[PDB]
Amino acid sequence: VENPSLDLEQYAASYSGLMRIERLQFIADHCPTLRVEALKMALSFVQRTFNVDMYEEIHRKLSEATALDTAWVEATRKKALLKLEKLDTDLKNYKGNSIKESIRRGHDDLGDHYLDCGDLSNALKCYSRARDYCTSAKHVINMCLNVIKVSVYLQNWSHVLSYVSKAESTPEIAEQRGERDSQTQAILTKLKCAAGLAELAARKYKQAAKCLLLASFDHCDFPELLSPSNVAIYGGLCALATFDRQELQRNVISSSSFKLFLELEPQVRDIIFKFYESKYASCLKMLDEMKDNLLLDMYLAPHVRTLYTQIRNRALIQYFSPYVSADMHRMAAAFNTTVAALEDELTQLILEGLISARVDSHSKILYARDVDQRSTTFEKSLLMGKEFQRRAKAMMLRAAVLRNQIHVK
Template identity: 45%
Template structure:
């Protein structure tokens, strides 16, 4: 007997994730390691204690005391054992004191550079301040420092470096409007074309921006353009496995069958990413070969881990809904009538649940059909092709007749020299300029022209 479809509460509470944190974090560098651990600590109870301990170990190798305080608050509010992340006021005070001294030195150096009026030194000083604030976790202030370097950029490489720094800080802030703007600015710089590693970074940032805006088809295209050979260059944002997940799921939700084959399955460039994520690869192959039950089962197994992803967790439900709806539409498309019992078996769901899904798709206009609820049969709406063809031909004839009449009218007006060239006054009323010139009396031969006559007024 087919298992009932998961809806409502069941779909919202998937099985616990079996994510191995050490293996998972090995692909990341920089502040994203701590941010991902902090999110996992909040989202997954089984991983909470291990994630907090690993996050504290990471954050104590940096100067980000604000994030350490945040981890302490997460531990106190979510963990029964307060010893998971103990308060370390001495470490916080020591790091803050050293940071204040370094900040004072950096600001003093920047003031000296401004006095010397050397653009390269001023740009370097602002970049150092931005890096300092970025490491401290003050991304908004870091962003302002990076933006200030714009006035001191003298080469295209300086502009690209400024854009990359702004994009990096904006992603950490979650401000993807800035990400899209500065990616476009960097891509329009000539030197960005020749650097393959830089191009991969920018495409990844652009893909995340499209993903955040729920533009899944555009996001898939950006992720598919990333090179697997330069994975270390964007490890501070995402890993190669993330690119396979983001690109594969967005493509499944938005690409048609032809694009899935040419741009994913048969594409040599993206195949390297899919090898790192076998479940996504198998789901793509199953979907393409219409093995929908197997595809959806693989995605369901993958779902608990996806819900722990820093960038993808908000889009998992929508992506899964789009993929399932697309599978139902593709299954029904070649048939005139379909036994819903066989269809439910193919999707490994109950007939009643399938009927509700199909009703929603029919109401949304994605499937042109009607449901025989008693016989459990789905009928395609019969369309009179003969009438539709005649209607299209008549409409085209009417449009052609209207265009020809307008063209003949214009030709006759031009022959009669009956042309309005423009209004003479501000209100758009009165005779045209040409008619006023023709009606004005011409001066006699040898009579001097006035200024108004000379300029045609």
């Protein structure tokens, strides 16, 4: 519900640029009985970065929930219009001079001004027009990054994933070896993070987990893209919910590239370790403690509930895996639920899922069920024979009616 453990000031300070406001918007969306105070704090802390339309929107929202210097904001709008006209004049001059770099810089500045103003369609058209100007691979990578970030702001993840894949596969698979163990400019980490975010938003958790663990710590933090803490949280939750024991051990537990990320968030590290070490009471308690804080995220909140269910389900099949007959009181104590709720969950899992067991509710014991292969094959073969005989008789009758030319007209 309400959680003061989340430091809004630090969370805003982690990101830079326009993106911060977007995140704060979700904090306004998910804040029962504290939306007004959270919005006031957001206005007090993040009044910078030249908020105009969202500033007025938030001001009107708080006025209607719980005049101004309109002359100055109108003068600022007029000055922005004059700056845009000057930029258009400079762009026309560059086109007359026929300089690719000059027109590229002018288009980038116009797109930046559209971003801080709020225009997206005109900016998108400008980016599409400027896409047709590529000379060297470095400029291709630069315009790919620009379009990827503006599409992340535009929230069209399929295009982001497709273009990330195309730009990754275009230069002979990242220059084969990778130009002597990657370059100083860690563009590949940015591409991996963008692909992970796109796949996570496209309801593909396993792919986001797989491609988000390859991001390295040398990239520091990209304010436009995800911060290291969010990278660790996403690559931990998706890995826990999707990777099996061998995959989790090989790619998360033992890999010497994600532990540095896990140092930023110790809670997710503890949760993953306790899941691996078959300690489920503590793991589930920490998961439930951190769920309330995670619900305030922007790219992970819609996927929270589902992920959690998945994680919990795994634990259940990981609890009963070594056992041939398990006492349900100990299971219920381990999972911090009552025996009746555990029985209902176990029945739901047995009906369809991976648990092959039977519940003895007289003594509350879950017995592992071992199928009999010979009887199963005999039953299936006899059923197939019966169905085949029925089909053959039906086809013979059909042949008779077709030969005799019987139909209704």
